[PDB]
Design a protein around this ligand. Sequence first.
Ligand code: K
Ligand code: MG
Ligand code: MG
Lengths: 177, 136, 116, 75, 50, 54
Amino acid sequence: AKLHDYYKDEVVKKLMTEFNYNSVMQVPRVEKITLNMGVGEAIADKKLLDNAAADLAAISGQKPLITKARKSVAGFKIRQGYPIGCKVTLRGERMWEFFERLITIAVPRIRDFRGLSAKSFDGRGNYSMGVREQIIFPEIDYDKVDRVRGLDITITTTAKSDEEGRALLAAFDFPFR
Amino acid sequence: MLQPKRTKFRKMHKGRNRGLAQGTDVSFGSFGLKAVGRGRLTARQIEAARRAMTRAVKRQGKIWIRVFPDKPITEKPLAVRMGKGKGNVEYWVALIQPGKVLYEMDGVPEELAREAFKLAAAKLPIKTTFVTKTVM
Amino acid sequence: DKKSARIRRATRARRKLQELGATRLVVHRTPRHIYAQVIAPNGSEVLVAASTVEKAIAEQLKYTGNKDAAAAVGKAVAERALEKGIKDVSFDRSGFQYHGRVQALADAAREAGLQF
Amino acid sequence: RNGRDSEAKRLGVKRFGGESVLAGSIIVRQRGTKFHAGANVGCGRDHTLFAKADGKVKFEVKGPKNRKFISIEAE
Amino acid sequence: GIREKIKLVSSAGTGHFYTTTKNKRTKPEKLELKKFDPVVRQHVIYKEAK
Amino acid sequence: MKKDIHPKYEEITASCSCGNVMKIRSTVGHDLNLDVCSKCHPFFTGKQRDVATG
RNA sequence: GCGCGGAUAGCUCAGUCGGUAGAGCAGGGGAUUGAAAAUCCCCGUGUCCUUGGUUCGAUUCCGAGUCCGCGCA
RNA sequence: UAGUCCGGAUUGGAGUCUGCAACUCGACUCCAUGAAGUCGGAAUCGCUAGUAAUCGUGGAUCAGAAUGCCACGGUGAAUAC
RNA sequence: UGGGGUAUCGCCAAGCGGUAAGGCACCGGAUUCUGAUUCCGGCAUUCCGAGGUUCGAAUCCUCGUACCCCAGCCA
RNA sequence: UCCUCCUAAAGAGUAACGGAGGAGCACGAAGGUUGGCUAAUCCUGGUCGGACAUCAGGAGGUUAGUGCAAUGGCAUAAGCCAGCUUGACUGCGAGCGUGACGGCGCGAGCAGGUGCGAAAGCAGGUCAUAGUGAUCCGGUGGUUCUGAAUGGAAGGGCCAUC
RNA sequence: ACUUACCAACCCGAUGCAAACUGCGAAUACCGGAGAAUGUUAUCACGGGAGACACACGGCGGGUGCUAACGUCCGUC
RNA sequence: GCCUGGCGGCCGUAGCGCGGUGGUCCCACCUGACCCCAUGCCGAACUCAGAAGUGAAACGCCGUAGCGCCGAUGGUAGUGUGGGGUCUCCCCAUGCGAGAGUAGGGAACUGCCAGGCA
Ligand SMILES: [K+]
Ligand SMILES: [Mg+2]
Ligand SMILES: [Mg+2]
């Protein structure tokens, strides 16, 4: 709720100032933050996907939803309805708390941190990034890791254009190399 | 020789060839070789006539073959009885009605189009005529 | 679309009740009102209607659009419907879950005598 | 390699428009719901449409998809 | 084919049995179905996946 | 949220070497020691020493 | 006439989604040897039968021919 | 009793010396890295006593460059029917 | 033309729908004055080509190719 | 032998050693009901991650799906997911369709008992159309219906069934 | 990373073909209802007796064949 | 009378796209969620308690024909019956008569009930 209050005064005010909106509700707001961990090496092992699920359970504060295969493809030796990833849809209060931990303490603990790419918008403002280690979150115990498992974050927001998402995210200072 | 790359069924019924044609105006080019007789045209007759035209008006010009075979004609071998299945697909014909512009030509004078269309209409089994591109 | 999803949830029971030919009590829940109307078996003409936008109902309520308001509306439709000779209807929940205040409205219509 | 076909199932419209029926009479023995059930018409398990009340057969075209209903007028 | 025939016998004292077919290989468990018993005239539990 | 299927997500206090005492909700279940925060991380000096080579 | 197998280096033959022509022997040069054979290494100006066409490009794909061979009412 | 406080290869950085000149292409040093290797298949070699084994030291060539060569000593066996 | 069979490492030849086994050869080491023999180690075919069923094809189905075997008769 | 399309001439039916394909099952959930949901493919962004495994957004519109061929159907979904379940009931059945017949099919409703639903209601298997075999002879369970003097029994019948 | 006489997806514009293609769609035929005239009930049901179940050509619509046959297989007259 | 909401008739002359406008009420987004209830994670959806804020999105209304859609008249094709020929195809008398295309029409029309404003 720290960055939610910071949103409600200074980001709403700041973006009403920058872009010449009329409505106070036309301003972009971040809808949700989805944390995917598409493990894929669970075609042979179930405890590997269980450990992946424990890691997203630690990084967010929620159980993950173990996702199944939509189509069967033979390129990767999977089958229809076989469990192959896990995700957490963070929204509401926990979106802002995770977003605070993310841009505050998790992003600086990235190895060789140069900055987050500004051209990682999908055309509709929705950011998506990938971390390569789960170690960069302070909850994951470094002595209890077995496999290095990155994950991909996706901030989904209500902006129409992607420069409008540059503005929204950049008003949280959200590093942007 | 022209033949569809990939059919949907190998053997077609005979059916009949009635009524008039649909391709009737000289559409693409400027001069046209239009059918008058009914008949049907194998792929060898279309190729023979096209070589007569392409030779005749040399590698200048532009020639459109407005008909395409796409109808398989089956024959039974020699000293085979009647019955015991439908024959085998030997060639492919196009069914022609009176009015089909069989060929078009553009980029030549009219007198060479007369000449190539005479030269090539003597390789076809149907009575044929010369038409021009009329404007509406 | 939320409204269109609701209508395609409604449609099966709607067409089934038009097929049986029963007078239906159509409910309609909005974030601050509930609407209830009794519709003839031909589907075109209404008979009875009460809702929280009527000031006869709205003045005696704290807030239009909660379970007390919906119970008031169900009582009103049952009273007016019994005054106009209608006894036995079929409840068209109109795409909403029979859970919250549509359940309060329909229970309130069953207490006050309307047979379904 | 060929030479087989099934027995002909005798589908179609058994009672046409305006044709008086008894209750229970099959109207259209058919294969999907090419014709849908209307007023006083039932649809059987194999999509056979049968007269559920007495009357007259009424072929109609209703609804947003232009479906072909079959009603029965009470008569 | 592979799918065998079994008798669902009645749990009441009657000898009345329904009869049906079971895949014996994939479902080796017995089959209990509360069916209708017309001698008792009542819905009784039926057993005996043969 | 549902009942207890989720991990215990209790408010803790993180503190790094930048003097940034910051209390947050995190399901570690333990108070935290860090080095780098968003305040006083070598991001801009890092970009400068990156460009400053030739 | 119809159905087939052939024409690629001096000789005897390989060679399919079209990609700078392959092998053995022969021939030439080198190493080795007293010398040579042998052995080892290196080296192909081949209208890929002729001729047109397609392609950016044909031994290869299409159209037409020449010669050799095999079989046929 | 561990690929370990074994092993030191390899590689990055920083240097010293010789020499007009260490890139191809020296030697040595310091910090860091820390492979392969856990006693070696068929087979094969040396040694009969200050010997084998093992431990160091010196010299020639040489501005600088030896794990080689030529010498020197320390400890010091087993076995030969 | 029909019916049947085969195509798997350079060669001959095993493969059960979840992994490719044998011999000869070839490569490296050793024995030997040198070569053969011998001994010690290795490697090795994603399975004729295309499409399909399957979660999965050398394996199952269909088609094409190439080679074998049997039949192609009475008049 | 059976199913689907065409031939087949806009009702039905319609032949050939005519053109094309399939079946000789599966399922105790893949059936019943209630509540909900909506595909293929392509583009963009994104850790390993790749032409194609997961995530997010957009275009798109059912080009998808339907246990297995093809045709006709399907959004109110007949497609997809979950809760509870046994109506994959027993006796009948107005009326129809379809066959030379044997036979086959559709069926509102009535009675008894049941499931789901708050209720209206829906449920006598599955989206439909294939998944099959008359009679005799005989096997197993039930029912005194018969039971060659009589009481039983044997055998027979009837119902279920192999 | 730099050039290119070659081919070409999708999309758009224009042109054809289809028994197993249809966002269209006749004539006819068929089913049902009413009405007039005409017809030796021509109609239906039940019962006695059959015969026949090798068809042929000709028109029209077709399959097969070579739009060959005094061919073959259907539909209808 | 104008506007809005519900349930229908009708099923593209009714749908799309582009542009403008609306919020007093209504509607929608919204605010919050410990409770009723819910997520194979998540109050996103469902649900509940509300009403601060905005009509941005949505939805409605008004324009606009770029498209979809409707669509004559005439002619053409086909075809029932009778007749004819040069007869694998056509012609004549006669009855029916398209599909496509053209001119054009065209951004709906309407019933019941309820609420707000005048
Ligand atoms: K050679
Ligand atoms: Mg030669
Ligand atoms: Mg040769």
